[PDB]
Amino acid sequence: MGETKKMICLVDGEHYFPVVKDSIEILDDLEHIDVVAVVFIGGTEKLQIEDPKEYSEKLGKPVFFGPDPKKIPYDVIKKCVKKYNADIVMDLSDEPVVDYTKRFRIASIVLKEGAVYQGADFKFEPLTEYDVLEKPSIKIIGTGKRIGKTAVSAYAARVIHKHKYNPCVVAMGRGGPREPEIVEGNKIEITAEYLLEQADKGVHAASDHWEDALMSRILTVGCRRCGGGMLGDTFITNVKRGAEIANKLDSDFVIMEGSGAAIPPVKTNRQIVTVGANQPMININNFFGPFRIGLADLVIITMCEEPMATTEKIKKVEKFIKEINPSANVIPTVFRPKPVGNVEGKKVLFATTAPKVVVGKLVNYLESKYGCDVVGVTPHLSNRPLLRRDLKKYINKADLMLTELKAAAVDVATRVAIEAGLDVVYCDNIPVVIDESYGNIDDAIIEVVEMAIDDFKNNR
Ligand SMILES: [Cl-]
Ligand code: NA
């Protein structure tokens, strides 16, 4: 009742019983603490009681045990937290029963159930959660840096828009005003003529909200946060107000996104998680990698090709995701350009900042899939004089310049192409399936949306 915290204590058999009983009795006798249950998590070397009902009677608490003393009983911990609606799991164990890795596995279980996980010198808080959305919703998050989370979220937004779900995006980003701003990405025209104006102001604004709306081409609520935690919380954010704005917009469906590791602290129906095949394995299979993957209804694996990842790296990542989240759908992908408009039969100058080692693959993909002739590649998208010099080589050999759609591309690359009198076709960098034995990415995204709408209708 009141503010008496329901605590579950983790204890081991590498302690003599009186020391364990002493600590449990102290916590049970202390104000504001209710020890609802004890989970014995392993060890037998110091046990002097063989009968577990005796152990429980002498301790004076319900005591839960896994069958194997050599391993952490992760499912017994999860079930105990749910049974007693525990507020805190207090770890009173030590080596050799726990180590760093096992404590992050325990933390991932406890924090997912909305309980604090604490020990002598560490405390982890579960994610802040505001239940504010009055529309069906998904959250799209990532497991690390440089995995193309932005390209995956904007692709998802465009797919959901294309299938007539009338989405909006709430983007909790790295800048913006204190009151969330509405950016009408639905009104943006992907033409050189329209963009010339609006990209310069986007570049110079103290936010990426314009670029978010440019990539998604949907109604965007521009939010901000300062930093992100290890689990994915943030110190301070206006995203709760951004969600309340989304409820009032002409939209039927809400996509919540966050910058970096920061997970929007707004309850959604379903989640998409992006994982990079290029990540250090430890960031996937250790720390809070498994926690994030455990949130997924759909995992998109990115960068599934050399030089970012070997076949062996890609299969280990797929294997790990199936072991921790077997119910999630999983799609492995690579990034490829998708032109916005027709390039079939056209001679193309491909304006791309992609590494030399992958340009060949992208060129072969454009020629084989979209039927263009790539006559040249220029990496000079940010420098006007160098792009001008490049255009001098190609201004008589190319029908158009094919350029990635980013705020930076409009202000520089578009202007110099239109100045040189060369047609401009934009392209999006999109996730493409590499392994037909996994599903269709668009169908996987729409399945999540349908599940979200069903959840929303059934909960009312
Ligand atoms: Cl277990
Ligand atoms: Na107490």
Residue numbers in the entry: 1 to 460
Question: What's written in the study?
Answer:
The space group was determined to be I222 with a single protomer of cDPGS in the asymmetric unit. The structure was refined to 1.7 Å resolution and was found to contain the entire polypeptide chain. This has been refined to R and Rfree values of 17.7 and 21.3%, respectively. The structure of cDPGS can be split into two domains. The larger C-terminal domain (residues 136–460) contains a twelve-stranded β-sheet (β7 – β18) surrounded by twelve α-helices. The cDPGS structure shows a tight dimer that buries a surface area of 2844.1 Å2, accounting for 13.7% of the total solvent accessible area of the protomer. The interface is stabilized by 36 hydrogen bonds and 24 salt bridges between the interacting subunits as estimated by PISA.
The reaction involves the transfer of the γ-phosphate group from ATP to the substrate 2,3 -diphosphoglycerate and the subsequent SN2 attack to form a phosphoanhydride. The unique structure of cDPGS is made up of an N-terminal domain which is crucial for the stabilization of the active dimeric structure and the ligand interactions, and a C-terminal domain that contains a P-loop kinase fold as part of its structure. Since the cDPGS reaction is exergonic at cellular concentrations, cDPG accumulation is favored thermodynamically until this reaction reaches equilibrium. cDPG appears to play a role in the thermoprotection of proteins, and increased thermostability has been demonstrated for several model enzymes in its presence.
